[PDB]
Design an enzyme around this catalytic site. Structure first.
Site, PDB file in Angstrom:
ATOM      1  N   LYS A  29      34.649  27.200  35.964  1.00  0.00           N
ATOM      2  CA  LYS A  29      34.091  28.402  35.293  1.00  0.00           C
ATOM      3  C   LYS A  29      33.999  29.593  36.706  1.00  0.00           C
ATOM      4  O   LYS A  29      33.269  28.841  37.687  1.00  0.00           O
ATOM      5  CB  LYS A  29      32.609  27.905  34.665  1.00  0.00           C
ATOM      6  CG  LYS A  29      31.934  29.191  34.400  1.00  0.00           C
ATOM      7  CD  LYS A  29      32.421  30.421  33.422  1.00  0.00           C
ATOM      8  CE  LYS A  29      31.399  31.658  33.120  1.00  0.00           C
ATOM      9  NZ  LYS A  29      31.990  32.579  32.274  1.00  0.00           N
ATOM     10  N   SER A  30      33.959  30.553  36.613  1.00  0.00           N
ATOM     11  CA  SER A  30      33.880  31.309  37.704  1.00  0.00           C
ATOM     12  C   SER A  30      32.384  31.078  38.120  1.00  0.00           C
ATOM     13  O   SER A  30      31.579  31.379  37.316  1.00  0.00           O
ATOM     14  CB  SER A  30      34.086  32.940  37.194  1.00  0.00           C
ATOM     15  OG  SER A  30      35.318  33.241  37.236  1.00  0.00           O
TER      16      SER A  30
ATOM     17  N   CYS B 146      35.465  40.976  36.119  1.00  0.00           N
ATOM     18  CA  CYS B 146      34.624  40.410  34.749  1.00  0.00           C
ATOM     19  C   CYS B 146      34.156  41.658  34.152  1.00  0.00           C
ATOM     20  O   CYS B 146      33.227  42.379  34.307  1.00  0.00           O
ATOM     21  CB  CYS B 146      33.617  39.556  35.333  1.00  0.00           C
ATOM     22  SG  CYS B 146      33.493  38.254  34.045  1.00  0.00           S
TER      23      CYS B 146
ATOM     24  N   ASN C 190      42.671  39.503  32.858  1.00  0.00           N
ATOM     25  CA  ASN C 190      41.456  38.957  32.340  1.00  0.00           C
ATOM     26  C   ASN C 190      41.470  39.675  31.001  1.00  0.00           C
ATOM     27  O   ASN C 190      42.403  40.344  30.644  1.00  0.00           O
ATOM     28  CB  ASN C 190      40.434  39.519  33.356  1.00  0.00           C
ATOM     29  CG  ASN C 190      39.082  38.780  33.182  1.00  0.00           C
ATOM     30  OD1 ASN C 190      38.589  38.299  32.104  1.00  0.00           O
ATOM     31  ND2 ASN C 190      38.479  38.436  34.348  1.00  0.00           N
TER      32      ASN C 190
END
Ligand code: FMN
Ligand code: FMN
Lengths: 311, 311
Positions: free
Chosen positions: A43-44, A130, A193
């Site tokens: 996970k980032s 993000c 993304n």
């Protein structure tokens, strides 16, 4: 027959989880290690542990998903210690991928310095897109800020590095990005993304379905395949061959996988579908891709990789 | 019960065709005039006749459509004479919309000057986002260029003018655009034009489905609704109230229409679904919307317009 060579490592198949899906805790990661995924990514992470946005923040849609997680993660140190320990028990064929998404340039440089100074021998993914962090726009839509950051990173980072990019929708943007990226010794670019800031509505309740950002969240799943494929293909034709591509977006069947590879992707990441199905998805999709290849008389991904035909 | 007031004109209902669908020839336009659409708009025109891109350039998809038409149109003069003739024979309640999409700022200004000098008393829509013209980036993704053009247009154009915008995916982009637009006496903004440069692939043939631009084309239909709704809502909360909004994107059922209205759109344009179904779609969707309103006890669009609830 899905053997793949990526970043000078060999993987049993090109399938991985997409960062953020089924990779929050060590327990999640161990489940991915036990699945048939060819590789997996964390996970980032951020320097500090984060709870993320208020609930509900994720909703399964008929055509995909919408979410505004807000980067919930157990912190950079937690993930680094886990990968370092796993490096000692060589019970996996291929490196592990480590995703970082600092809230600022300073935070990303700090984490990269720590990764550079550690014994980590895996691959790092720098998340420059993000779409769900309140007050922070997507860095990858600011070409100048992106070029500046990468210049400073490459003054010290010598380990394998790839960047996770948001989708682009204008050919000139692909030209500009490809030119910025081609100047660096990047290992790969991962497209794409989530499609940022979409909206889903419950007509009966007459309201949004996620609590954060007034309902605006990242879109994934079937909705985004056309854009994902276009991004993978557009970059495949502009990037110097040294930089490989990971295709992410709308992958749910072996056919979707086949399409990304035909466009030029080497590794493939499954997000929304894995969130819905669990790690068993890897077993199913590997079988589906092999069937497609069998019917076409293909024995390896090299037989059709990047060979999408124009009309 | 779908009576609407837009640009100080009264319309029987908020539905219209999206520019580019069923509006190329006088014959198409007459069919729109005879249908139940509340209003209609012409195909975006250029100073001179254009054949458009090679075929196939449009393909129906299960979840929408992909196209790279290349602006095929019968020329500015053809559409202007048609609208002028229609003004004389007053057989319509409500102005007709006229779309223009010049290949350069100079071409746009020239057409606008001609519209300003003529007796045209309808509404003009300036297309700042055609994603299917080879070699021309979407003007609306260039904030500075967009501000300059509008500055110049408003030094002489006094008639009702609206702008057709491409989808935006970062909240900061909405902030920047709203500030640029809020400074002008614009009549409306129309969100959104196609999601630009997507790619669709025929896995059997292992090739793209449209001939121009190596298969890259604009996406519309179910694929883009989340993005369309987000753009309409994002602008509705940032634009000064004098600027109304036309919502376009993914509308095919009364429920889709209801969602756009709930976000803040006043007029609604149907593209992909109208291309697939024909003008009879207006009759169907009006009934579906009224049925939704009846179930909820709404007697006019004002009862719920722009009233989307947050959690
Ligand atoms: C619940 C959720 C959380 C995600 N978190 C991240 C994240 O931490 N880092 C990242 O780079 N991408 C994140 N993604 C986005 C993806 O990794 C992926 O790019 C996206 O979902 C598109 O693929 P899909 O169509 O298979 O979902 C997340 C997606 C979802 C569904
Ligand atoms: C075949 C086709 C041609 C189009 N031509 C134009 C055009 O001339 N001008 C314009 O502003 N938009 C054009 N559009 C885009 C739309 O008007 C609309 O913004 C888009 O299709 C999104 O709506 P939909 O989801 O209902 O298709 C075209 C779309 C299609 C399907």
């Amino acid at each position: 027959m899905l053997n793949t060579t990526f970043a000078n490592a060999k993987f049993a198949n090109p399938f991985m989880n997409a960062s953020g899906v089924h990779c929050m805790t060590i327990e999640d990661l161990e489940e991915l290690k036990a699945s048939q995924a060819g590789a997996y990514i964390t996970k980032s992470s951020t320097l500090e542990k984060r709870e993320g946005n208020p609930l509900p923040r994720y909703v399964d849609l008929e055509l995909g998903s919408i979410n505004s997680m807000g980067l919930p993660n157990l912190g950079f140190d937690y993930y680094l210690d886990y990968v370092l320990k796993n490096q000692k028990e060589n019970a996996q064929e291929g490196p592990i991928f480590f995703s970082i998404a600092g809230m600022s340039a300073a935070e990303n440089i700090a984490m990269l310095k720590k990764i550079q100074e550690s014994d980590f021998s895996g691959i790092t993914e720098l998340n420059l897109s993000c779409p769900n962090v309140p007050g922070k726009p997507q860095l990858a839509y600011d070409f100048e800020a992106t070029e500046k950051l990468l210049k400073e990173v490459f003054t010290f980072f010598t380990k394998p590095l790839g960047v996770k990019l948001p989708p682009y929708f204008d050919l000139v943007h692909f030209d500009i990005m490809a030119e910025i990226l081609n100047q660096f010794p990047l290992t790969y670019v991962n497209s794409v993304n989530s499609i940022g800031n979409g909206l889903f509505i419950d007509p009966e309740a007459e309201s949004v379905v996620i609590k954060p950002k007034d309902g605006f969240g990242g879109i994934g799943g079937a909705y985004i395949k056309p854009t994902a494929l276009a991004n993978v293909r557009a970059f495949y034709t502009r990037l110097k061959p040294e930089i490989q591509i990971i295709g992410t977006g709308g992958i749910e069947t072996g056919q979707d996988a086949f399409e990304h590879l035909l466009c030029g992707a080497t590794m493939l990441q499954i997000g929304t579908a894995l969130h819905k199905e669990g790690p068993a998805i890897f077993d199913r999709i590997i079988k589906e891709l092999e069937e497609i290849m069998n019917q076409k008389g293909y024995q390896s991904i090299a037989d059709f990789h990047g060979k999408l035909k124009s009309l």
